[PDB]
Amino acid sequence: GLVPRGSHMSGATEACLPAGQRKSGMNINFYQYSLKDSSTYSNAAYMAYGYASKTKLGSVGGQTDISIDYNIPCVSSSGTFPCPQEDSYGNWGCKGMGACSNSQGIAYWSTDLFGFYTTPTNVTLEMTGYFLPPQTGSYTFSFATVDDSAILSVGGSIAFECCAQEQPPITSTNFTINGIKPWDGSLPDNITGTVYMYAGYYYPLKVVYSNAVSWGTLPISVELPDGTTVSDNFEGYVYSFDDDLSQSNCTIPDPSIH
Ligand SMILES: [Cl-]
Ligand SMILES: [Cl-]
Ligand SMILES: [Gd]
Ligand SMILES: [Gd]
Ligand SMILES: [Gd]
Ligand SMILES: [Gd]
Ligand SMILES: [Gd]
Ligand SMILES: [Gd]
Ligand SMILES: [Gd]
Ligand SMILES: [Gd]
Ligand SMILES: [Gd]
Ligand SMILES: [Gd]
Ligand SMILES: [Gd]
């Protein structure tokens, strides 16, 4: 057969070939999320698109270093220092700092999240960009843990529409990784989703992340088809393009036959 037969029943992930000026990194949009609201982010509709119905706080572009690791302050005898969560104890202190005088349960202001001055204790953010696979094959994306609620979506009409990165979010709830905070209880660690990708195509990528209280954590990784792992720093893999809703050929519904 002169040509590949194509993935079974339109099974391939939709990708894109934007013709515009490529920019290194992801765009991060920040939206309001209420301190101690442990229910809003438990809804699929909210995590897929509803977050953008809340007040948009701001944005930062060109982000390649994408894992989230936010630590609240411990106001201690020696000054004020961020406390790794696993070092917090009692009611409460931080190991190597003694007792902390401040509440774990109030809002805290910090630039920890991509240099944007906001409240990482209570916020929802949206990461958008395109993932560029250097190798053809199966890619396994993972969250090592989720504090508090998160999704990852890959693919045209799943993350967002090709050449329309900056548009309001689409409604698809067909998440690649579903790390939505369960109504009852939590989820295991190392939650994963696999996508088969063709080298040199641009795959829309969306990560929506929310925290309601104190610590926030989202360590992001991908395992390449060659078995190596890229964690946190996605430089060389993630790019942004300004919208071009007029580029007619931008969507590749089936990269296996394109
Ligand atoms: Cl601090
Ligand atoms: Cl201590
Ligand atoms: Gd980082
Ligand atoms: Gd960094
Ligand atoms: Gd770092
Ligand atoms: Gd951090
Ligand atoms: Gd940071
Ligand atoms: Gd840091
Ligand atoms: Gd950092
Ligand atoms: Gd579409
Ligand atoms: Gd949290
Ligand atoms: Gd492996
Ligand atoms: Gd733009």
UniProtKB/Swiss-Prot annotation:
Q: Specify where it is mainly localized.
A: secreted
Q: Per the record, which residues fall in region Sugar recognition?
A: 184-227
The record's subcellular location field reads: Secreted, Cell wall; Membrane
- Give the biotechnological use: For many industrial applications in which the yeast S.cerevisiae is used, e.g. beer, wine and alcohol production, appropriate flocculation behavior is one of the most important characteristics of a good production strain. The ability of yeast cells to flocculate is of considerable importance, as it provides an effective, environment-friendly, simple and cost-free way to separate yeast cells from the fermentation product at the end of fermentation.
Q: Where is the PA14 domain?
A: 61-236
Q: What is known of its domains?
A: The number of the intragenic tandem repeats varies between different S.cerevisiae strains. There is a linear correlation between protein size and the extend of adhesion: the more repeats, the stronger the adhesion properties and the greater the fraction of flocculating cells.
Q: What is this protein called?
A: Flocculation protein FLO5
Source organism (scientific name): Saccharomyces cerevisiae (strain ATCC 204508 / S288c)
Task: State which gene encodes it.
Answer: FLO5
Give the shown range, full length included: 23 to 271 of 1075
